[PDB]
């Protein structure tokens, strides 16, 4: 029971570290998602003026 509760403690801390990881990966994705769209349109609006 000590082995199976050390594991329950480890899988509790791993699933909460993976929660804190998944949150900051979802925020760092949305920064990269929004910066991709902003950089994509500003290439297109530059080409739309340059012709």
């Amino acid at each position: 029971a000590s082995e199976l509760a050390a594991r329950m403690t480890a899988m509790s801390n791993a699933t909460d570290n993976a929660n804190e990881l998944k949150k900051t990966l979802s925020i760092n994705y949305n920064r990269a998602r929004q910066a991709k769209i902003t950089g994509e349109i500003l290439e297109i609006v530059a080409g739309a003026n340059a012709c």
């Binding site: 297109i44 739309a48 012709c51």
Partner: peptide, 12 residues
């Protein structure tokens, strides 16, 4: 395409 005078589409 840009020298033919066309506005660029997505991704250049």
């Amino acid at each position: 395409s840009a020298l033919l005078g066309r506005m660029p589409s997505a991704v250049g």
